[PDB]
């Protein structure tokens, strides 16, 4: 089980925040306001495969309402910057 339900908090709230923010740089559904984050937030812990096994980073998926519509965004967070990427942004998603 490499995925960890992690909790919808303000932490998450603004990873939420960051995806929306992501998303509307990207352009593909236009500007979007971000509403919240929901359940379920799934976080995916990355190893370095060699060595001690150290943590890379993260990735997280989570549904965000972001102008009235449910989308899934996936964000990669780097372990020791905590520099986020958005991976995928995707919707309009069926509720979880």
Same mark, same amino acid.
Do not use: H
């Given at each position: #089980? ?6 919808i908090g303000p932490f998450t709230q603004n990873l ?7 998303? =509307? ?6 500007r979007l306001t971000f509403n919240k984050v929901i /359940? ?8 370095? =495969?060699? #060595? ?22 996936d964000i990669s967070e780097d372990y020791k910057t ?5 991976? /995928? ?8």
């Amino acid at each position: #089980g490499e995925w960890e339900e992690i909790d919808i908090g303000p932490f998450t709230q603004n990873l939420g925040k960051f995806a929306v923010d992501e998303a =509307n740089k990207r352009g593909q559904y236009g500007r979007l306001t971000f509403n919240k984050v929901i /359940r379920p937030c799934m976080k995916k812990t990355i190893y370095e =495969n060699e #060595g001690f096994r150290e943590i890379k980073g993260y990735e997280y998926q989570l549904y965000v309402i972001a102008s009235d519509k449910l989308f899934r965004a996936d964000i990669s967070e780097d372990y020791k910057t905590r520099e986020r990427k958005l991976l /995928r942004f995707d919707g309009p998603v069926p509720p979880p």
